[PDB]
């Protein structure tokens, strides 16, 4: 029998997606406040900025984004090819496994055990655990594909599948490290080579974990919510393969005008610029799908979320290629502008689209026709949008200010500004960003309340069968 979708794991990962969303973005607000008012460091090793920052990072990407990806993929793949999740217990393992990963991050990072490698900061035993859980996840997903009903595989699963495989490769390669003790290892690589492995990994992290996987999300939920057909299947092909191949090359745009050889840097710029097209093929395919049904935007705030999500996605997959130009990076690099780009994509694309996706699926998965209050979905939408825009704005201001002031030369050739002057210049920005992020976070609380209210309603909730 068993021809009822396994909604259990999806349910767990959804709830936990909202929870880690709260925790992670809370952390974000907090460290933002630390940048504004350093006393919030509290002269404690475990609560100082340097240690909390990668906690914000990992919690927000791998815990929030991660759980979003799990819930979404497990729901989406099951319906999009019409069978129960392959090896459902193994999926449950991937749940508790992933939770154990996040909890290990939460304990270990403030405790000071970090590789110092961005988005790969957890030490080797946790990297082993991650590898195991991910292998299991791969088996569950690709297995569910392998035992589908339809002949064709939906493009959403091209993106999901890709994301899974390449994240696995990425993770294993960039975390090759000699263990010294329980929670201390040294990277296999050093210097320029380590930098390149690091940002091949680093960029392709947001490239496949935060772009591809979430394009999968978009490809299921945008058409499903809008109840329109997907525009331009041909585009789905082009944009998918071109993205999947070009994005890997985009590594060196992080290391512009560094000790990394010129040739690599250039390869990175050129391919980052080529990357503009496929990336946009994504948002085109997403938006043109909504054509005709735009009147739904005033009606349905979930759809609002998804669409605006695509707006920010395009904006940052335009900003990115631009900042990947050496002359632009010459100013952008090391400045708050990078962070601005980051959260444009992070709040505006990843967060928005996963929000929308959850607002869609959570009722379904909890045997419920819709969310508790659609009004709160709208107020969430506005809080989150205002927040994102404020964040972006403050970081552009700060970033331009910084780049400019740092390189500012006088008429007699001397440097115009002390670094401390630039630092001081940035404080208003730090505060505005703290407020924007705060507002977004508030929106997340609204989501938490809403979701909770709907979660209350039915203990047996196995509705849907097909």
């Amino acid at each position: 029998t068993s021809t009822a979708y396994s909604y259990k794991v999806v349910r767990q990962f959804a709830i936990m997606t909202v929870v880690w969303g709260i925790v992670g973005m809370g952390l974000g607000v907090f460290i933002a406040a630390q940048l504004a008012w350093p006393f919030l460091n509290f002269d404690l090793p475990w609560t100082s900025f340097g240690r909390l920052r990668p906690l914000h990072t990992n919690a927000v990407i791998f815990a929030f984004g991660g759980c979003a990806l799990f819930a979404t993929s497990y729901y989406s793949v099951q319906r999009t090819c019409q069978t129960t999740l392959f090896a459902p217990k193994l999926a449950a393992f991937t749940f508790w496994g992933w939770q154990l990963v996040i909890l290990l991050a939460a304990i270990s990072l403030p405790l000071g055990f970090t590789s110092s490698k961005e988005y790969a900061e957890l030490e080797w035993p946790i990297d082993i655990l991650i590898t195991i859980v991910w292998v299991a996840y791969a088996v569950v997903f690709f297995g569910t594909l392998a035992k589908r009903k339809v002949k064709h595989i939906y493009v959403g699963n091209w993106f999901f599948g890709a994301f899974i495989l390449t994240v696995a490769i990425l993770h294993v390669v960039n975390n090759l490290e000699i263990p010294v003790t329980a929670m201390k290892s040294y990277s296999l690589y050093a210097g320029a080579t380590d930098a390149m492995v690091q940002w091949w990994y680093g960029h392709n992290a947001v490239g496949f974990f935060l772009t591809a996987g979430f394009l999968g999300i978009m490809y299921y939920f945008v058409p499903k919510q809008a109840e329109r057909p997907v525009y331009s299947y041909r585009l789905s092909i082009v944009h998918f393969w071109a993205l999947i191949t070009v994005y890997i090359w985009a590594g060196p745009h992080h290391l512009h005008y560094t000790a990394l050889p010129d040739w690599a840097q250039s390869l990175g710029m050129v391919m980052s610029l080529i990357l503009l097209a496929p990336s946009w093929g994504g948002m085109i395919n997403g938006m043109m799908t909504l054509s005709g049904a735009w009147h739904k935007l005033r009606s349905d705030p979930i759809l609002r979320f998804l669409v605006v999500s695509l707006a920010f996605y395009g904006m940052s997959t335009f900003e990115g290629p631009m900042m990947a130009i050496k002359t632009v990076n010459a100013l952008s690099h090391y400045t708050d502008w990078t962070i601005g780009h980051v959260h444009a994509g992070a709040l505006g694309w990843v967060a928005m689209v996963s929000i929308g996706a959850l607002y869609h699926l959570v009722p379904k998965v909890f045997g419920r026709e819709q969310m508790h209050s659609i009004g709160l979905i709208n107020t969430h939408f506005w809080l989150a949008t205002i927040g994102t825009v404020l964040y972006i704005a403050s970081m552009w201001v700060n970033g331009i200010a910084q780049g400019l002031m740092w390189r500012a030369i006088n008429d007699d050739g001397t440097l115009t500004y002390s670094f401390v002057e630039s630092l001081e210049a940035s404080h208003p920005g730090f505060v505005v960003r703290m407020i924007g992020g705060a507002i977004f976070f508030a929106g997340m609380l609204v989501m938490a309340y809403n979701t909770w209210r709907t979660v209350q309603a039915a203990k047996p909730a196995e509705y849907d069968a097909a």
Binding site: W294, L297, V307, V308, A311, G314, M315, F318, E319, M322, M323, I325, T327, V328, A330, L331, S332, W337, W396, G399, I400, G403, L404, M405, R407, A408, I409, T416
Partner: peptide, 29 residues
């Protein structure tokens, strides 16, 4: 403010982002 080639590149990049966003944003109305 101090004006350089690089500063100009940055400024028009940000401006272009404002333009893209504004265009898209009003395009959604």
């Amino acid at each position: 403010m101090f004006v350089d080639n690089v500063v100009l590149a940055g400024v028009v990049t940000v401006g272009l982002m404002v333009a893209f966003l504004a265009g898209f944003g009003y395009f959604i109305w």
